[PDB]
From a paper:
Among them, 5-fluorouridine triphosphate (FUTP) is a potent competitive inhibitor of VPg uridylylation in vitro and also behaves as a potent mutagen for picornaviruses including FMDV. To gain insight into the role of FUMP-VPg1 in inhibition of further uridylylation, we co-crystallized 3Dpol in the presence of the modified 15-mer peptides FUMP-VPg1 and UMP-VPg1. Tetragonal crystals of the 3Dpol complexes were obtained in both cases. Analyses of the electron density maps showed that the VPg1 peptides could not be traced in any of the complexes, most likely due to disorder. However, best-fit structural superpositioning showed that 3Dpol crystallized in the presence of FUMP-VPg1 exhibited a large conformational change in the β9-α11 loop, located at the N-terminal motif B. On the contrary, the structure of 3Dpol in complex with UMP-VPg1 was practically identical to that of the apo form. Motif B is formed by a “loop-α-helix” structure located at the base of the template channel and is involved in ribonucleoside triphosphate (rNTP) recognition, template binding and translocation of the nascent dsRNA. In the apo form of 3Dpol, the β9-α11 loop is packed against the fingers domain, forming part of the template channel and participating in template binding. But in the presence of FUMP-VPg1, loop residues from Ser298 to Thr303 in this motif B appear displaced by 7.8 Å towards the active site, thereby closing the template channel and preventing the correct positioning of the nucleotide template in the active site pocket. Large movements of this loop have been observed ranging from an open conformation, in which the loop is packed against the fingers domain, leaving the active site cavity accessible for template entry, to a closed conformation where the loop is found inside the catalytic pocket, resulting in a conformation that sterically clashes with the template nucleotide. The structural data shown in this work, together with previous evidence of VPg fluorouridylylation, prompt us to speculate that the inhibitory effect of FU on VPg uridylylation might be explained by the stabilization of the β9-α11 loop in the closed conformation, thus preventing the correct positioning of the template nucleotide in the active site cavity of 3Dpol.
Author numbering: 1 to 476
Write the structure that this text describes.
């Protein structure tokens, strides 16, 4: 995005805390090159002269202006992807009821009852529970009033900026590259869910290469589905972006929203409008109010679908800008926000697409970290997606999501205080795919102190999870 105004203000949005993450017993064994992100300017691990306030917003270097020809190409690519999307999903996109918006529907989780409420409710000491009855799926009078302002397209708002208290590579910790989440007002989230919730549910239910989205996938079971699909292609690419979310230009975002969320596809006219409120945003951080043009508000969960849709349109755009006769079936892909796997039987030159992605304000590199850029001949067993590799289990022949051992060492090395037992059982579910020897090694530090699930128990759970009849067949 482009920072068009930075001004000081009364009311500090107090967003410089201490980490709830503490080292575990594993920290001293593994000595990871990771640590909690800096949550304070006075953090002694920060490099000399690094200001948190400056670095967290440094990703906003501009709002790339696309030419008329490029915008008309982008619109064709958006309308072509939308055609595919709404063909698979259908056009049952009537607004969600307030009850359904809060409680969710099949394929869409209920709203979180006690997460951050956003502005100005955070400054008035009003928690989410004060504004919305999540039990009954009803709203208080303030949310009710704000919903009626959005009906009229008169709603205005500020994004509350929170630092992401999490583990980061030590080099990113020192450089002050703390990640941020933009918390929009709870009523804005409610209304967005009203406008596109049915669509969001359908995309979760229909995740797969056909719609180019892994949002709402279960890697445990869906790696088999994904792996057998990409294994069929001569060429597979994993594509790295630099600040994908920030670098979505106003032109791209606006056109995507216009082509994807049309009334003719069953959407309320206001679906396009509430999404378009994401383009030109005001961000509250401490005493600062930063106005940005372009980019998606920072996040993962809340913005996954939009980022995934843009990734799909970007690949069609980039290939059509370089080659003639490119259609959706020229390649296959799956995306989860900025994360992407692309495959084609065609020898697509991804190295030559770099300038074409640059016309969208996006910088692509091979995920590989090759000294050269993109190459042909890569397969599904070479790539990373959701921090997971695709490897066949020798026992069953099924693809399993294998995470890098260094990443599992880092995850096991820190925990929120009092959560260690819960975290071990969760991370065991990830580490089981590393094999029995590495699984044993990763949890050795915790043996005798916590309950570590047997490798055997999680392996048997997994085989049943991915194919029920296969597990049954082994008792022939």
């Amino acid at each position: 995005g482009l920072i068009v105004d930075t001004r000081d203000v009364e009311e500090r949005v107090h967003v410089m805390r201490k980490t709830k993450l503490a080292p575990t017993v594993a920290h001293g064994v593994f000595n990871p090159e990771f640590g909690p992100a800096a949550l304070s300017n006075k953090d002694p691990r920060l490099n000399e002269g690094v200001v948190l306030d400056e670095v967290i917003f440094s990703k906003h270097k501009g709002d790339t202006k696309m030419s008329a020809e490029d915008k008309a190409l982008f619109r064709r690519c958006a309308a072509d992807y939308a055609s595919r999307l709404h063909s698979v999903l259908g056009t049952a996109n009537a607004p969600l009821s307030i009850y359904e918006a809060i409680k969710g529907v099949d394929g869409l989780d209920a709203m979180e009852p006690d997460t951050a409420p956003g502005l100005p409710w955070a400054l008035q000491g009003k928690r989410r529970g004060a504004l919305i009855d999540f039990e009954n799926g009803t709203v208080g009078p303030e949310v009710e009033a704000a919903l009626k302002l959005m009906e009229k397209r008169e709603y205005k708002f500020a994004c509350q900026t929170f630092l992401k208290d999490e583990i980061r590579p030590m080099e990113k910790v020192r450089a002050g590259k703390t990640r941020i989440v933009d918390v929009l007002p709870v009523e804005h989230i409610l209304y967005t869910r009203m406008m596109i919730g049915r669509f969001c549910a359908q995309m979760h239910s229909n995740n797969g290469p056909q719609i180019g989205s892994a949002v709402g996938c279960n890697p445990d079971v869906d790696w088999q589905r994904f792996g057998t699909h990409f294994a069929q292609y001569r060429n597979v690419w994993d594509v790295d972006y630099s600040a994908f979310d920030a670098n979505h230009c106003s032109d791209a975002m606006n056109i995507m929203f216009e082509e994807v969320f049309r009334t003719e596809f069953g959407f309320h006219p206001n679906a396009e409008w509430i999404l378009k409120t994401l383009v030109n945003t005001e961000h509250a951080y401490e005493n600062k109010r930063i106005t940005v043009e372009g980019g998606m508000p920072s996040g993962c969960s809340a913005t996954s679908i939009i980022n995934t849709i843009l990734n799909n349109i970007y690949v069609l755009y980039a290939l059509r800008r370089h080659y003639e006769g490119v259609e959706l079936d020229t390649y296959t892909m799956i995306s989860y926000g900025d994360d992407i796997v692309v495959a084609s039987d065609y020898d697509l030159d991804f190295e030559a697409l770099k300038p074409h992605f640059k016309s969208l304000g996006q910088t692509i590199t091979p995920a590989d970290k090759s000294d050269k850029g993109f190459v042909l001949g890569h397969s599904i067993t070479d790539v990373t997606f959701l921090k997971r590799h695709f490897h066949m289990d020798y026992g069953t022949g099924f693809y399993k999501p294998v995470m890098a051992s260094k990443t599992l060492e880092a995850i096991l090395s820190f925990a929120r205080r009092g959560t260690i037992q819960e975290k071990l059982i969760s991370v065991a579910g990830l580490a089981v795919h590393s094999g029995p020897d590495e699984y044993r090694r990763l949890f050795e530090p915790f043996q005798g102190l916590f309950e570590i699930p047997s490798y055997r128990s999680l392996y048997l759970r997994w085989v049943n999870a991915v194919c029920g009849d296969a597990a049954a067949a082994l008792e022939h």
